[PDB]
Design a binder for this molecule. Structure first.
Ligand SMILES: Nc1ncnc2c1ncn2[C@@H]1O[C@H](COP(=O)(O)OP(=O)(O)OC[C@H]2O[C@@H](O)[C@H](O)[C@@H]2O)[C@@H](O)[C@H]1O
Ligand SMILES: Nc1ncnc2c1ncn2[C@@H]1O[C@H](COP(=O)(O)OP(=O)(O)OC[C@H]2O[C@@H](O)[C@H](O)[C@@H]2O)[C@@H](O)[C@H]1O
Ligand SMILES: [Zn+2]
Ligand SMILES: [Zn+2]
Ligand SMILES: [Zn+2]
Ligand SMILES: [Zn+2]
Lengths: 153, 153
């Protein structure tokens, strides 16, 4: 386990013949209101475009997933709500340890008057994506699929 | 766009204050048979465990997503089938450009007599995960959600 680089949000290490990128854990928040899902968009230098995502962010020191979920929802959309843990996933275990904890937010309230808030029906997000109009982040796709599977009724 | 490292499956670069990891595109295959989903497991050094995933892999030079999907299904499970493109997603656009193209495989046939083949009902995979018994890769979770949303009827 030798380190070739230690950065702000990631470290580059070598474990045998395996190239490994250590990355802080993350959270993502799925929120539905009046049939629209709360997506967010922002320029992502890594991909040169703004994919459709859902409120998300890295967990800060001393913070647990639930608290991070609350903070990101508030900082990115100015909203607060009743959060429930859903499930988690490793974004790409073949090379990084980034783990994302996904939450559901209900009974949204505006607590606060670079990130674009994009309320959109999940059916419309899926269609636009299928048309090649917009790209998805893993969190955005997860939100869309979760909705079609458990939030239509 | 300065490069600090050029490896086998990734490059570490710096674009201003942004740390960016270039990574080859990937494919993932969702396959259902007799109510069971085709998951695979393998030791992942990056996370120190074997999460539940679906057949997946990196696209090789001269290969397009569909062809890569065919190859990975065959190499990891010894099966072939009729593939249909579903959608794509960036695994974590906040730091890497890895993009995953997801396909659906139907009418599976065994063409060939480190990776463990795990046929499991998606409902069971979700339950085990909820119990903290198993972890998910983004591809594994996507497969589970996709099934609950569009493959139950
Ligand atoms: N961290 C790593 N560093 C260097 N080489 C690696 C690493 N992980 C795997 N490899 C090499 O790459 C080959 C595997 O290639 P793939 O077909 O692409 O499959 P794999 O990466 O192991 O899993 C596929 C899927 O999970 C995701 O994490 C990944 O991005 C891909 O979508 C193997 O022979 C192995 O030697
Ligand atoms: N590639 C990068 N390199 C260095 N710093 C970065 C990078 N990308 C963002 N940042 C810094 O981190 C802060 C953003 O922190 P987060 O709250 O974690 O949100 P962000 O990473 O931008 O998007 C959140 C979600 O998308 C995923 O890609 C990510 O892993 C997370 O789950 C910003 O103030 C910014 O300066
Ligand atoms: Zn944030
Ligand atoms: Zn921070
Ligand atoms: Zn492979
Ligand atoms: Zn290869």
């Amino acid at each position: 386990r030798t380190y070739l680089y230690r950065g702000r949000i990631l470290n580059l290490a070598l474990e045998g013949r395996y190239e490994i990128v250590e990355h802080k854990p993350a959270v993502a928040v799925i929120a539905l209101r009046e049939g629209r899902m709360l997506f967010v968009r922002q320029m992502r230098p890594a991909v040169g475009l703004a994919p459709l995502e859902i409120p998300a962010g890295l967990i800060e020191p001393g913070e647990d997933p639930l608290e991070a979920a609350r903070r990101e929802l508030a900082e990115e959309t100015g909203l607060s709500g009743d959060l429930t843990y859903l499930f988690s996933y490793f974004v790409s275990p073949g090379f990084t340890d980034e783990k994302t904890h996904v939450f559901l937010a209900e009974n949204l309230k505006e607590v606060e008057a670079a990130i674009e808030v994009v309320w959109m029906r999940p059916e419309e997000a899926l269609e636009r994506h299928q048309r090649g109009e917009v790209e998805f982040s893993a969190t955005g796709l997860v939100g869309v699929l979760y909705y079609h599977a458990f939030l239509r009724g």
